[PDB]
Ligand binder design. Structure first.
Ligand SMILES: Cc1ccc(-n2nc(C(C)(C)C)cc2NC(=O)N[C@H]2CC[C@@H](Oc3ccc4nnc(C(C)C)n4c3)c3ccccc32)cc1
Ligand SMILES: Fc1ccc(-c2c[nH]nc2-c2ccnc(F)c2)cc1
Length: 328
């Protein structure tokens, strides 16, 4: 068992192995550190009172289980996970360690067409992987994309969101699909090409109106899929609007970029391009290699249907800390 040392940083106590030096805040709370074992800089997340409730306890387990599974160049992965606790009984703190990228996509974004190709290619390559595990990110946005000085990119999730959200989520459809993430990538790509927020809505109603102004009000095929009478009464009561000409709206962009945007920002989620289809789009011909775009190992999310005690979620989490094997 390693030797821990204790310090206070910003009202927060950090008790970490001596392996990790030079802790400095960035954000749970997050520190940058130096990993003396590898010579690389790391980000360390301390979970805030991980067993305060059944929902916290289940969140704690969910994040550890997801981060242990993710092994892809464009998705956050775990270098280490530790607790200063020496027994299950005393276990009350979880620390997660990953590679420090040093910036997010806002920070980058303060870009050529070639930069946009490479950045969106990497997002889609990570999303292919995630979606192959039957996971939906649900909150992709610039601040959940970590970028290093080489413009290498990883998807993560820190836990306005609404600006990149799919319209079917603003409408509160409970049966939305993976392509909510492709909507978000569309919103991000538009913002990298134009340097403006595509849909900077002030609330869920404002956000939906900005969206329908570009993509048009629902057509008949989509209206027939809407179960909610109140949702339909509302949408069909708006001034009806055609889909705009994306070629006019994004005029000046690489027409190949515009063509992909149209495939991502289709209003009916059933007609949106998937991540795997998007990687094969001609816009990524300089990056696409179907032999180097892997899918995930099977991901057991059956725990999500369970109603357990805090102590049960805690013991499961504890077993996941103990079984952790670092990457070579
Ligand atoms: C309840 C729950 C919450 C999140 C999730 N989740 N789901 C996912 C995917 C994408 C769906 C697979 C990922 C996560 N969790 C997650 O991403 N953790 C990050 C959150 C902050 C992060 O801080 C970092 C990390 C790297 C980094 N590089 N640069 C900088 C800035 C300081 C500039 N970083 C700043 C982190 C540092 C350690 C360890 C972990 C983490 C699942 C469940
Ligand atoms: F104004 C609208 C109307 C429909 C959507 C929408 C987009 N894709 N899928 C849907 C959808 C499908 C089934 N039920 C729903 F409630 C929504 C988005 C905004």
């Amino acid at each position: 068992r390693p030797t821990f040392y204790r310090q206070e940083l910003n009202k927060t106590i950090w008790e970490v192995p001596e392996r990790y030096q030079n802790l400095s805040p960035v954000g749970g709370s997050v520190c940058a550190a130096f990993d003396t074992k590898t010579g690389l800089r790391v980000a360390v997340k301390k979970l805030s009172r991980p067993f305060q409730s059944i929902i916290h306890a289940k969140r704690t387990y969910r994040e550890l289980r997801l981060l242990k599974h993710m092994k892809h160049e464009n998705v956050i992965g775990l270098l280490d996970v530790f607790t200063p606790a020496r027994s299950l009984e005393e276990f009350n703190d979880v620390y997660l360690v990953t590679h420090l990228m040093g910036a997010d996509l806002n920070n980058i974004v303060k870009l050529t067409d070639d930069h946009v190709q490479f950045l969106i290619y990497q997002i889609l390559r990570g999303l292919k992987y995630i979606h192959s595990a039957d996971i939906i990110h649900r909150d992709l946005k610039p601040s959940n994309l970590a970028v290093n000085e080489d413009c290498e990119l990883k998807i993560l999730d820190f836990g306005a969101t609404r600006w990149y959200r799919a319209p079917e989520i603003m409408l509160n459809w409970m049966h939305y699909n993976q392509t909510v993430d492709i909507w978000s990538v569309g919103c991000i790509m538009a913002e990298l090409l134009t340097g403006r927020t595509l849909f900077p809505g002030t609330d869920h109603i404002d956000q939906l109106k900005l969206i329908l102004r570009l993509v048009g009000t629902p057509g008949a095929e989509l209206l027939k899929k809407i179960s909610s009478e109140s949702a339909r009464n509302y949408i069909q009561s708006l001034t009806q609007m055609p889909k705009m000409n994306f070629a006019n709206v994004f005029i000046g962009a690489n027409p190949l970029a515009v063509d992909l945007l149209e495939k991502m920002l289709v209003l009916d989620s059933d007609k949106r391009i998937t991540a795997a289809q998007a990687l094969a789009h001609a816009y990524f011909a300089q990056y696409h290699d179907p032999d180097d775009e892997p899918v995930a190992d099977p991901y057991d999310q059956s725990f999500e249907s369970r109603d357990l005690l805090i102590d049960e979620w805690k013991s499961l989490t504890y077993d996941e800390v103990i079984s952790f094997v670092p990457p070579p």
